[PDB]
């Protein structure tokens, strides 16, 4: 599923992200946009044999099981797959437990490139919440 800016947002405010561990909404939703183009079912392979899956763009080396990334963990304890649906429950309790890691935000790259220090409140403008 391709969700719509707006769409996105209420839908992860409704699972409780908005100012999760002190990121506001906006925060999420900038991430969202430029790791997976607001694509559910996007998927990327990295150089070291991990993918990358759905909205979030969560990662196989540590995070989900694919069943092909010999040596990695499965600290959300579901398969990649399940990171794919038109659901985003999923996505969002595994980024709930990736965002209180340590790094906080900073896990996503794309976060720290592109949203990080911006104004991301734009990214919730003129959405009704
Ligand atoms: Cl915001
Ligand atoms: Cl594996
Ligand atoms: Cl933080
Ligand atoms: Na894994």
């Not at 939703?29 to 392979?45: I, M």
């Amino acid at each position: 599923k391709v969700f719509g800016r707006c769409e996105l947002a209420a839908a992860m405010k409704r699972h409780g992200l908005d100012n999760y561990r002190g990121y506001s909404l906006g925060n999420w939703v900038c991430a969202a946009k430029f790791e997976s183009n607001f694509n559910t079912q996007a998927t990327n392979r990295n150089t070291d044999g991990s993918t990358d899956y759905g909205i979030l763009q969560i990662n196989s080396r540590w995070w989900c099981n694919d069943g092909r990334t010999p040596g990695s963990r499965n600290l959300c304890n579901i398969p990649c797959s399940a990171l794919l649906s038109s659901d985003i429950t999923a996505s969002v309790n595994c980024a709930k437990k990736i965002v209180s890691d340590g790094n906080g935000m900073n896990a996503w790259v794309a976060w720290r490139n592109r949203c990080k220090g911006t104004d991301v409140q734009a990214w919730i403008r003129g959405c009704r919440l």
